[PDB]
Amino acid sequence: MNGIHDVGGMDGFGKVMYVKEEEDIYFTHDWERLAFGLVAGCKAQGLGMKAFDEFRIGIELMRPVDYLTSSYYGHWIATVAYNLVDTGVLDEKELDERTEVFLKKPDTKIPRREDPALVKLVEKALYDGLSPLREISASPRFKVGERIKAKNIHPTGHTRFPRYARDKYGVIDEVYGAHVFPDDAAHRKGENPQYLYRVRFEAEELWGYKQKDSVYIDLWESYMEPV
Amino acid sequence: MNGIHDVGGMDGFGKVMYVKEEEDIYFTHDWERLAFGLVAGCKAQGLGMKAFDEFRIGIELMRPVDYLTSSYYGHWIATVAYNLVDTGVLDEKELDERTEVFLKKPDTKIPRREDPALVKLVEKALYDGLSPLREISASPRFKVGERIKAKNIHPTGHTRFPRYARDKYGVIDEVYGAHVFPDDAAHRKGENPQYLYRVRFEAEELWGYKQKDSVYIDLWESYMEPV
Amino acid sequence: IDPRFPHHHPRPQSFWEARAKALESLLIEKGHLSSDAIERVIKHYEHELGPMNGAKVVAKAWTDPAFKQRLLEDSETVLRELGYYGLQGEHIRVVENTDTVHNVVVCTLCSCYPWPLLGLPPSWYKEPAYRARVVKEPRQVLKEFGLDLPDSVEIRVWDRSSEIRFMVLPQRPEGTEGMTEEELAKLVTRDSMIGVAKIEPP
Amino acid sequence: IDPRFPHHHPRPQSFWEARAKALESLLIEKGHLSSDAIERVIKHYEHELGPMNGAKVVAKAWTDPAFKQRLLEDSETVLRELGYYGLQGEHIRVVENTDTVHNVVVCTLCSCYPWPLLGLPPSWYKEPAYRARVVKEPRQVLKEFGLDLPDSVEIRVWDRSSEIRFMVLPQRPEGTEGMTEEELAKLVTRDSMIGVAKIEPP
Ligand SMILES: [Cl-]
Ligand SMILES: [Cl-]
Ligand SMILES: [Co+2]
Ligand SMILES: [Co+2]
């Protein structure tokens, strides 16, 4: 989707807010910590999302005005809500009512429950991770060193193909192997893995600029075609 | 500039808010009316802006979060402020202080003054308009029917070349004549007029889509090159 | 406001209001503007201009074949002769809807609209949804206006990237036999002159 | 709220807070989450992980040529052997800064960052300014961090569009002769492993 999230190459967002590392506080509000717990806790159990693909599309679907103002963990809250409702884990009406309760009475008590089995399960997920690497029977269409065409495609659903790289020539830098295909997986349409490549693009090609800059982007096979 | 204003081809902005014409109120706040008076009144006298080029860049320079939330006449206020300060008509400190006065005391009295000569001058501007058409000694580089290349250029200042049309093939539909060149004029760098063309682009070329859709865009000569 | 994140925090609309008043006050104090100059502009755009001018041009085109021919051959000369000319209406073109061609006008980059002929643009015309979407999925946008064109009808979207303006000339509907030019003009909607609606039979 | 313009009005951050609590409450009531599962996650990301892990890898590379060679030849095997593996760190690559090549890592589409090796990303890394700009004007972005590279130095920006993660291996600075591996590790900054800074002489 050609959304507000896809910012690469945009002008006008201003200076980067530099801060020294030691002063770069992770969390300033408890709800931000909670957002992390919600995301990892749900994902570890496959609730609403099993990999990050579905997670990302829920963020991408935010209203632009929300995306730009919610703050970062606001994205995480938005996508957990989106995905839990979308998959039928939570009912939208119930969620909205409960939201209203905490809006009007922020000090409403949170129910307590200990589940050490669930802790172990979550811990296992944090340490084991979840690799999207797969094997497929096909061979790679492209080879290291090949000049390829990064296609002009405009999926309305999820994609990992940034707009700034579309309709451009690039050079294959590496064949990673086959990875779960985001444009399908984010919409629960199957892993349908495809070869993933790293592709180098020159500044002259991306922007028409004259400096010694390049961008290395990872692109799925179906994003590209031979020249 | 590749800014938040350049929305053509973006996904995620949602449904169009249809409203019946008779119910589509022009102004709901007096400051919105005032914004119109400020813009036209200043422009008529060449204060801050002489044509719309400088006007547009001031809007394009808004913080994205402001652009999306200010409402439409908020853009107009932002660009009048920007341009009057940029050209030295108003001092930023004085403007900020006076802003603060009206923030804390909204009912502060507005000074009254009648200037019938100025009224006539403004009226003349509203009726006479200001054509950007010029004559130049050069001939057009492109001809009706010619297949051209819409270049991959990325000016950091003002341009009228929407990003969605860059790095694309199109067909010349008309040679309008030479027009004041926005990419220069917006920055007070001279009219430097160039031939302006209307160019037809097909949906297949812009988006890779299969319907009978096309876009006719007006492009200055320097945005394009022969094939 | 955490200074890492000033960009999360929009100006409230009260800021723009205050800013407007501050500009107004300073410019009048400095002799750059006057109360009556500001009011003159407001009167013009809120009251003097409107879509009725375009409506008259459409009705005339429907009732006078020679006029319609001249309009389509050289709209800028013809419109200027009628007095529909001014700021943001110096160069106005007219494109005819036909049975297999549908025209839609947009300013993707801002809001450009022919004030002297049509008055101020619709609320939605200036907003991101219409601007973003109409160049890429015009059929979907049109459906939100109640216009569901067949696949076989070609759509031409006219993105106003220059000061050249376009008005759509919509087709005269059924059921209008015997109507006068003035009566037909009352049928012509603002939306039909942008391309987001056809005109309904009376 | 004028129903023409709901998109002008962002959710306040109090909404997200309330929403978070509502989700937490409902999920615990339904048996999907527990208090201790949520706390376990917070402990891991706020306290257990951090850039010190990457720092140790850098210092080892500087002090042990054979290790640096293995790391650059097959980083994923080597990093997994060290235990720097987990969620968002399943496939970690390492790119070496050299005198004429400077590496910078970004996730233009979101925030992708190798948590198991580097901990949580910088505030600015996740925000639009860095994300938008670093792929197009990296020299300008780097200058805002105090890194002013000569034109002759090539910049390679690594946009993390897949789950493959990258760490930058920065060069050992002058003035470090005789330092132990542990002492060198204390020199390695988070920013240097993203590519937005070189390491200063002690
Ligand atoms: Cl029609
Ligand atoms: Cl370095
Ligand atoms: Co416009
Ligand atoms: Co990311």
XYZ file of C-alpha atoms in Angstrom, chain A residues 5-11 13-19 21 24 26-27 31 33-34 36-38 40-43 45 47 52-53 56 62-63 65-74 76-78 80-81 84 89-90 92 94-96 98-99 102-103 106 110-116 118-119 122-123 125-133 159-160 162 164 173-174 176 179 196 198 200 207 209 211-220, chain D residues 6-11 13-38 40-42 44-51 76 80 85-88 90-91 93 107-112 115-116 118-124 126-139 141 144-145 151-166 188-192:
210
model
C 4.341 4.753 6.377
C 6.286 4.572 3.123
C 8.355 7.683 3.732
C 11.613 6.894 1.935
C 12.530 9.817 -0.308
C 10.105 12.304 1.219
C 11.068 15.883 1.911
C 9.998 15.979 7.803
C 12.730 18.232 9.152
C 15.892 17.673 11.173
C 16.660 14.457 12.957
C 16.260 14.938 16.711
C 19.742 13.879 17.858
C 19.989 12.736 21.486
C 22.437 7.439 23.800
C 17.606 8.336 24.981
C 13.160 3.834 26.108
C 9.778 4.465 27.808
C 1.255 2.250 28.511
C 5.750 -0.758 28.232
C 2.348 -2.399 28.181
C 5.377 -4.133 24.121
C 3.962 -6.778 26.427
C 0.741 -6.943 24.446
C 5.007 -9.987 22.191
C 2.532 -11.821 24.403
C -0.045 -12.097 21.648
C 2.465 -12.968 18.935
C 0.675 -17.464 21.047
C -3.121 -14.407 18.659
C 5.342 -9.610 11.671
C 3.572 -9.341 8.338
C 2.851 -4.345 9.883
C -3.794 3.670 10.453
C -5.340 7.021 9.580
C -3.189 11.775 11.054
C -2.971 9.068 13.726
C 0.174 7.515 12.308
C 1.981 10.847 12.568
C 0.730 11.780 16.045
C 0.158 8.597 18.091
C 3.852 8.121 18.938
C 5.602 4.883 18.137
C 3.917 2.561 20.627
C 0.643 4.026 19.552
C 1.641 -1.027 18.256
C -1.594 -0.490 20.157
C -3.388 0.284 16.867
C -2.926 -5.184 18.130
C -6.432 -3.795 18.255
C -7.411 -9.046 17.378
C -10.250 -12.764 19.166
C -11.921 -9.569 20.388
C -15.025 -4.349 18.407
C -16.659 -4.744 23.619
C -13.226 -3.248 22.988
C -14.672 0.220 22.380
C -13.831 -1.005 27.630
C -11.750 1.755 26.069
C -10.502 3.536 30.910
C -10.867 6.918 29.267
C -8.044 5.825 34.084
C -6.423 -4.133 35.973
C -7.292 -7.771 36.647
C -4.312 -9.840 37.969
C -3.435 -13.356 36.911
C -0.298 -15.465 37.144
C 0.328 -18.063 34.415
C 3.854 -19.416 34.684
C 2.474 -18.770 29.602
C 5.606 -16.986 30.874
C 6.582 -16.219 25.884
C 10.177 -16.495 26.991
C 9.416 -17.036 21.774
C 11.708 -14.163 22.704
C 14.769 -16.404 22.605
C 13.882 -18.739 19.712
C 12.505 -16.064 17.390
C 10.689 -17.046 14.227
C 12.656 -17.336 11.016
C 10.813 -16.735 7.714
C 13.391 -18.735 5.766
C 4.077 -4.896 0.338
C 7.751 -4.570 1.290
C 9.198 0.856 -1.100
C 11.067 5.069 -4.082
C 23.925 -8.283 -4.537
C 22.898 -11.551 -2.894
C 19.310 -14.883 0.458
C 11.374 -16.247 2.533
C 14.508 -12.926 -1.477
C 19.476 -7.971 -1.807
C 21.895 -2.370 -4.885
C 17.084 10.318 -7.427
C 21.686 12.797 -7.751
C 27.066 11.808 -4.986
C 28.639 8.460 -4.145
C 25.560 7.082 -2.398
C 23.735 3.798 -2.865
C 20.877 1.933 -1.266
C 20.789 -1.814 -0.633
C 17.157 -3.016 -0.417
C 15.808 -6.577 0.052
C 13.324 -7.467 -2.658
C 11.215 -10.568 -3.233
C -12.864 13.820 10.756
C -9.376 13.215 9.313
C -8.137 16.549 10.686
C -8.547 15.290 14.249
C -5.935 12.851 15.622
C -6.594 10.507 18.481
C -2.360 10.005 23.305
C -4.857 9.453 26.161
C -6.838 7.374 23.674
C -3.924 5.069 22.984
C -3.304 4.729 26.694
C -6.914 3.837 27.386
C -6.940 1.431 24.413
C -3.818 -0.291 25.762
C -5.455 -0.784 29.180
C -8.671 -2.022 27.577
C -6.737 -4.585 25.535
C -4.768 -5.663 28.607
C -7.909 -6.042 30.685
C -9.913 -7.949 28.116
C -7.051 -10.298 27.182
C -6.334 -11.165 30.827
C -10.038 -11.665 31.567
C -10.338 -14.008 28.608
C -7.277 -16.040 29.639
C -5.151 -14.934 26.717
C -2.602 -13.018 28.719
C -1.363 -12.893 32.288
C 0.221 -10.214 34.403
C 3.492 -12.124 34.567
C 3.648 -12.759 30.815
C 3.366 -9.017 30.139
C 8.367 -10.826 31.419
C 8.381 -9.037 28.064
C 8.911 -5.620 29.606
C 13.430 -8.482 28.554
C 13.310 -5.389 26.355
C 13.836 -2.667 28.939
C 16.561 -4.399 30.932
C 17.927 -7.685 29.545
C 18.814 -6.605 26.040
C 20.940 -3.675 25.008
C 23.752 -2.437 22.775
C 24.606 -15.570 11.174
C 24.063 -17.546 16.897
C 19.795 -14.647 18.562
C 16.044 -14.303 19.146
C 13.005 -12.420 18.064
C 13.994 -9.902 15.393
C 17.158 -14.566 13.621
C 19.259 -13.448 10.601
C 24.470 -9.607 8.978
C 14.087 0.698 8.185
C 12.305 3.190 5.917
C 9.015 1.313 6.166
C 8.906 1.020 9.990
C 11.636 0.412 12.588
C 13.253 -2.941 12.015
C 16.843 -6.410 19.247
C 18.839 -9.457 20.396
C 21.484 -4.101 19.894
C 18.424 -3.790 22.157
C 15.688 -1.288 21.271
C 16.239 1.227 18.476
C 17.007 4.920 19.079
C 14.041 7.260 19.369
C 14.964 9.004 16.141
C 11.751 5.074 14.225
C 10.671 8.590 13.264
C 9.948 9.970 9.795
C 12.812 12.451 9.471
C 15.594 9.858 9.635
C 13.607 7.241 7.710
C 12.629 9.568 4.873
C 15.905 11.359 4.465
C 18.711 8.881 5.039
C 18.109 6.943 1.808
C 18.185 10.170 -0.276
C 20.507 12.616 1.476
C 22.552 10.477 3.908
C 25.368 13.055 3.948
C 21.532 13.319 7.839
C 23.185 16.321 11.916
C 24.923 13.618 13.967
C 32.670 13.459 -1.019
C 35.191 10.768 -1.831
C 33.810 8.390 0.791
C 31.092 6.112 -0.611
C 27.958 5.684 1.483
C 25.944 2.466 1.466
C 22.490 2.688 3.081
C 20.945 -0.669 4.016
C 17.132 -0.449 4.005
C 15.660 -3.293 6.089
C 12.686 -4.295 3.935
C 12.919 -7.915 4.945
C 13.579 -9.718 8.242
C 17.329 -9.711 7.473
C 19.010 -7.403 9.988
C 22.340 -5.564 9.726
C 31.651 1.064 21.112
C 28.574 3.276 20.891
C 25.079 2.266 19.834
C 25.171 4.979 17.182
C 28.401 3.550 15.686
